Write a protein that binds this ligand. Structure first.
Ligand code: SAH
Ligand code: NA
Lengths: 265, 265
């Protein structure tokens, strides 16, 4: 009679919370999805060993189209868990799943875990200064989407930071690197010419948040566009004007050039 | 000879991640602060029991003025942990403490935990749609903070949601309720008269996120301003333009007036 939405956290199998783990262990059935994102520092087998439960993986279709036929029926007479990377209900379409549960007469509870939305705080950028967020998608065929560029423009104009999710092909295990994101934005800039993203724009790259050894790099596009930030996934952030304390952190912790202490403050 | 910034999470001692617990258990010294937020479902005793260590609680003054004299010295010959509610770097100035650690020649690591910043996902409002955030601070003497009003205005003009962290006076054991925040906002509206926050404004209240039964309520200020949302902590949210599915969730899960289902595109 109960469905638990449990977050797996940021990077590896130890990023789930104590509460999430213990609840998952008490559930009769455990489902999970890895299409919104993947857990780069672990594997399905490792997650299964930790929880001590067989984990049934669901595709995007399984969830978006058949959540009520796959998961909810079992939640009617059993305790069921639905695992997702990060914090549950962060992914745009997930909240609606709770409405589906309600409609099926199924109780649902949310067990939180770390999300990249809050983990980006490790970049030293103040959380309150983040504006609307967006996702950088690849142009394809006769389609060249550029809304993420406008998001950066509107946030920066108001002195706000912009966190950018990069394209991911979960099934194909293909990720867009920060380097690729930068090249794309420069391309959009050449077309838009709004002076939003150029070789002189200061950016921050965050890779493997959650790991004990994440990669946090800050610098101008001209110098970072060909740098190696390691394995994906990568998060690209275009900061708005910096508070001196944010700049100092980027210099001391993210290897930013001293230059930002005068140029971007 | 290392320092760990470990978040304890949203509500109780089990909101810590497995990673954080296992690391906290093996630290020689454990410090913590409980002035940046409130963990309404646990006690220092329960936290110490879980980690199996005596915890030295520090005041805002101990940290802000003496972190380098109290904590860092021990981090040179021992493994030390600094625990905080929620995520250690979210809506705190703790990130700067990493600079102090570095300058003191002490390596530091950050272990994230669920944060209220991402926990807002449980309100059904798309997290990417949140704009600049703000804090509603208690007026003091002749000083009456009002900047948070302009933040709501700026975001609303852009159709973005506004998350409002609420004030806290740990030493006085005072935690601002959503009701108090609404009263303060109405007073600011009277002064500025920008039509930003009135009795007809739709707001969402999230209380005690992290608990199994948090209070999630949506409605007009006139109807919620005197409603009991249970014990603190609380956060107040002023949504911007709603997507149909956001309104549906607010009605089905947050008990919002069915009339908001009819969005004015
Ligand atoms: N469980 C919870 N439920 C509702 N609001 C919460 C909350 N935890 C924190 N807050 C809100 O955030 C304020 C503290 S700001 C510090 C936030 C913390 N670092 C984190 O990561 O969550 C509180 O005064 C309150 O308004
Ligand atoms: Na945000």
């Amino acid at each position: 009679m109960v469905l638990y939405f449990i977050g797996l956290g940021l990077y590896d199998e130890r990023d789930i919370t104590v509460k999430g783990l213990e609840i998952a262990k008490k559930c009769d059935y455990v489902f999970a999805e890895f299409y919104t994102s993947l857990m780069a520092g672990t594997t399905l087998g490792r997650i299964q060993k930790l929880i001590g439960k067989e984990i049934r993986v669901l595709s995007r279709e399984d969830v978006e189209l058949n959540f009520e036929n796959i998961v909810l029926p079992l939640a009617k007479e059993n305790d069921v868990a639905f695992l997702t990377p990060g914090d549950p209900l962060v992914a745009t379409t997930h909240a609606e799943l709770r409405i589906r549960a309600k409609r099926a007469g199924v109780e649902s509870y949310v067990i939180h875990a770390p999300s990249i939305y809050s983990a980006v705080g490790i970049t030293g950028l103040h959380i309150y200064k983040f504006g609307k967020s967006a996702t950088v998608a690849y142009p394809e065929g006769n389609w060249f989407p550029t809304s993420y560029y406008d998001v950066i423009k509107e946030n920066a104009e108001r002195g706000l930071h912009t966190m950018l999710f990069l394209d991911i092909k979960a099934e194909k295990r293909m990720y867009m690197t920060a380097n690729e994101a930068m090249e794309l934005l420069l391309k959009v800039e050449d077309m838009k010419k709004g002076g939003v993203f150029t070789d002189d724009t200061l950016v921050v790259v965050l890779a493997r948040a959650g790991s004990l050894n994440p990669t946090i790099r800050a610098g101008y596009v001209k110098d970072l566009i060909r740098e190696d930030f390691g394995d994906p996934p990568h998060i690209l952030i275009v900061p708005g004007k910096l508070h001196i304390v944010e700049a100092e952190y980027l210099v001391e912790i993210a290897g930013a050039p001293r230059e930002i202490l005068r140029v971007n403050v």
